[PDB]
Amino acid sequence: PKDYDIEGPEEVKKLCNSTYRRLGTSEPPVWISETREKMAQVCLNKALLN
């Protein structure tokens, strides 16, 4: 699964370009520090004869 290919059917083969935009595909959905996610948790959330 190559973003760019060097053996593909294209005409100009740029060797300076990489074949992969990223090192991996699985970036964390949201980007939040621990000092935020954690400290940002404070938010979150009888008788018969009275």
């Binding site: 018969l48 004869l49 009275n50």
Partner: protein, 50 residues
């Protein structure tokens, strides 16, 4: 106020012990005339080893 969460609890105890005693009379008095009414139609309750 901290006495009052303790005040209402003991007041619930007074009502509790005075309605159990009164309901005890009603249940025994009902059961006897339940037996009496059935005894006129030729039926009765089963007491174990009666």
């Amino acid at each position: 106020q901290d006495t009052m969460v303790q005040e209402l609890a003991l007041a619930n105890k007074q009502l509790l012990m005075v309605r159990q005693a009164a309901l005890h009379q009603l249940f025994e008095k009902e059961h006897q005339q339940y037996q009496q009414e059935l005894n006129e139609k030729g039926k009765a309750f089963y007491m174990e080893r009666l």
